[PDB]
Amino acid sequence: KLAQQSAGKVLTLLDLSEVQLDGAATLVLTFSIPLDPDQDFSRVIHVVDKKSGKVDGAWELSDNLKELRLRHLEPKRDLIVTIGKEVKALNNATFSKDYEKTITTRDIQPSVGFASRGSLLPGKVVEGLPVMALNVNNVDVNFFRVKPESLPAFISQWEYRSDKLLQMADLVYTGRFDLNPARNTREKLLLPLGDIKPLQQAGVYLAVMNQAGRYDYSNPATLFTLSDIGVSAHRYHNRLDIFTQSLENGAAQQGIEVSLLNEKGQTLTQATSDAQGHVQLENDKNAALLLARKDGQTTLLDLK
């Protein structure tokens, strides 16, 4: 097959490197021509940790057959790679001699955090929060329900970037979540909240990861909203056609207090949704947020 194009070409080891493949540090050996897939690579290529010995895992040839990979490397480790003479190519080429190569794997630090700062998008329930983790098996998380009256002030502070700046909210839940990402694999995971009843009550919540551990921490706080009010804003020249509709059945929602707030969370204008769940306002160059509320339910919409 590919053996015909590489016929007459020598087998050369072009490179030895560490690359991030999927979410894990991977050892890559790049060869000049396609390698034979039927050979036992563990018999001809040895990877040995200077202190702990024989590195576990099997070699994986790339689809192009010129790269040989060994995934999920341990960080900050000294490795001896011995490429034996008898490594065979598709065209039957071999090396002239053994090669010995060293590599110190990258010092990648344990890291955990939320996938994002969150969204103002409302939900009827909160099933899970997406998180990401590398060699952080568990995390302690504090959940705060923002006081209904403190919300425009709270959200305006949050949207602009804080120890006592949290008495705008009430602690409603503390839990330890066992992530256990696969060793040396940066994984996308979920904090399951579905069965935590206090996080299923209407409101805007802030989830905060405990700040105790020598980790990167990326996004330690995230925001989520539990609301029945679905808000949509349509812009045409200077007009805002705002529709408030139920997240349960899509029906028009009447009597919803809709406000346009500035960057300080101050009301610029206010109106009530009609029988068709409609609110028509002029655009305000200072409007940063749209706020919709009724009977303890609150939805925010970013106009920026």
Structural domains in the chain plus CATH codes: 13-104 (2.60.40.1220), 111-226 (2.60.40), 229-302 (2.60.40.1930)
Can you tell me which residue has the tokens 């040396």?
Answer: 184
Cα–chain center distance at 243: 31
CB atoms within 10 A of CB 113: 20
Measured between alpha carbons, how far is 233 from 251 in angstroms, rounded to an integer?
16
Q: What are phi and psi of 276, to 5 degrees?
A: -95, 20
For the sheet with 13-21, list strands across it.
13-21, 24-31, 67-70, 60-61
Say how many CA atoms lie within 13 Å of 119 toward its Cβ.
8
Residue 63 and residue 66: Cα distance in Å, rounded?
8
Element (H, E) at 99: strand 99-104
Nearest CA-CA partner of 203 in 260, 125, 283? 125
Using DSSP's 3-state secondary structure scheme, residue 149 falls into helix
Return all residues near 195 (Cβ < 8 A) that are at least 6 apart: none
> In this structure, are residues 204 and 248 in contact, taking their beta carbons and an 8 Å threshold?
no
C-alpha angle with apex 253: 251 to 258, nearest 5 degrees?
145
The experimental technique behind this entry is X-ray
Sign of the CA dihedral with 250 first, then 256, 260, and 266 last: negative
